[PDB]
Amino acid sequence: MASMRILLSNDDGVHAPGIQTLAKALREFADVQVVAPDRNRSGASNSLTLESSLRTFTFDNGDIAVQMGTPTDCVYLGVNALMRPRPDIVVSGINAGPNLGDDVIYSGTVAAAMEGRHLGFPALAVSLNGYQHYDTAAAVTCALLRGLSREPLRTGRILNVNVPDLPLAQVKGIRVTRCGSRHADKVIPQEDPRGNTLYWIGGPDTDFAAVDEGYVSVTPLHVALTAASAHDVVSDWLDSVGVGT
Amino acid sequence: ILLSNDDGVHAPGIQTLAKALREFADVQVVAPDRNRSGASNSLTLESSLRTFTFDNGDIAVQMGTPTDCVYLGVNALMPRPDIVVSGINAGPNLGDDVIYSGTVAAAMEGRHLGFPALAVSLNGYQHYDTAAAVTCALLRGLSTGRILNVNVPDLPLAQVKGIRVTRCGSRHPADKVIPQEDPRGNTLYWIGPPGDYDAGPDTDFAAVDEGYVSVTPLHVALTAASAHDVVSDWLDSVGVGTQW
Ligand SMILES: [Mg+2]
Ligand SMILES: [Mg+2]
């Protein structure tokens, strides 16, 4: 029953209908602090903005927008400075458009969640497979948060949630999925004065399939980029050709 | 060699590397037509990407991503390269940022396509020669399915101490959040170390602090660590589809 501290961010910026819908739904049963970008960051790199002062705007309701802040900037500032006591969880969304595939790491929605993966509860990244039923997506997120406060799930990770763009009553249920994959298939030029020649035009368990079949898709993600297997197969490769003239 | 980057075909880091590498190896430059450090690094999956070709051979993909430059370079524009390299970046690529880095991304498209790949970055602004020298030394190797991720101190080559096989950190422990004001009184926040330290003994972060070339074997993480049943059981135990 008790009040969970939620850091809410996104990719689409403080004004987006997705984050503002979710925030209203969440403020009914949780303490919500919005720290989001000052603009829509679709197509924009994610990174922590280091050693460069970030200006902070405060809205009437207390939402805060970070001037030129990436989704990771917002999460970093929210976790370490802007939400006191420190948030229990980071929620990122609701994003306008899906976040499916192995390409999700390059998305700002996932990136914000990823930045909040070390908190008390695993981070949620929430995307709507469209632009209409934010209500459905906000409902699915609430169910998830209630569940986490009931029986906690292991931290250090994120759940990537994709919600079909459907009325709540038409959603068939929730599946635990794994990410899909979309991609040599390059084509030919067609410029009117032939300005250039070199051109391009570039599973039953995948997240794509569950969403297409009308289900909420939940993919558990973690970041691990090193093998102890690689660490010394290049270390003995380095000490092979050491210092010498 | 296919040489690309994140900061553009005219970038100092890539030009200094392409010149130093043209000593030992043959290089084909395919890089974005503009600085992309602020742009997303995914492939542009369903559009027609124009290319520009300079007198020296260099190719610039118009509005290209760093991965686009590797994909479009290999399977459409360039004999097949021996090693795909991602030019000397202006600025570090340390810890969590490697997931987000355009420089790292370009190397990643390389090994997905099935090539050896190198990504290199300068922790500063001045000593591209130092970084080029380090890369040339490294490329001079016996001439893993993982990319090396290399970070170089911004020092004259003679001031550089060693070379460390490192792993990635998350975020630097020394990087704190420091509240500030501007002359207008606006509230501002500054992320980073107030001076000097305390980094993980084996991390990419640590090496650079101590004047050492960080080299990390790398592969991006979209895995679950087979934690699919852990969550599957969690949705059954707690009512998540109940209230509808
Ligand atoms: Mg977005
Ligand atoms: Mg760059």
Numbering used by the authors:
A (entry chain A): -2 to 180, 182 to 200, 209 to 251
B (entry chain B): 3 to 80, 82 to 146, 152 to 204, 206 to 253
Q: What text comes from the article?
A:
Examination of the sequences of this segment in StSurE and PaSurE suggested that D230 and H234 of StSurE might be the key residues responsible for C-terminal helix swapping. The double mutant D230A/H234A had no detectable activity (<0.1%). Comparison of the thermal melting profiles of the wild type and mutant SurEs suggests that the double mutant with a broad melting profile might represent a larger ensemble of structures in solution. The structure of D230A/H234A was determined by Molecular Replacement (MR) with Phaser using H234A mutant dimer from which residues corresponding to the C-terminal helix (residues 227–253) were deleted as the phasing model. Examination of electron density map and geometry of the model revealed that as in H234A, in D230A/H234A mutant also, the C-terminal helices are largely swapped. The final model for D230A/H234A consists of 245 residues in chain A, 244 residues in chain B, 230 water molecules, two glycerol (cryo-protectant) molecules and two magnesium ions. In both mutants, the two protomers of the asymmetric unit are related by a rotation of 167°. In D230A/H234A, the loss of interactions due to mutation of Asp to Ala is compensated by the formation of an inter-chain hydrogen bond between H228 NE2/A and T232 OG1/B (2.79 Å). In D230A/H234A, the segment 147–151 of chain B is disordered probably due to its proximity to the C-terminal helix. The loss of D230/OD2 - H234/NE2 hydrogen bond also leads to a large shift in the position of a loop near the active site pocket such that the mutants can no longer bind phosphate required for activity.
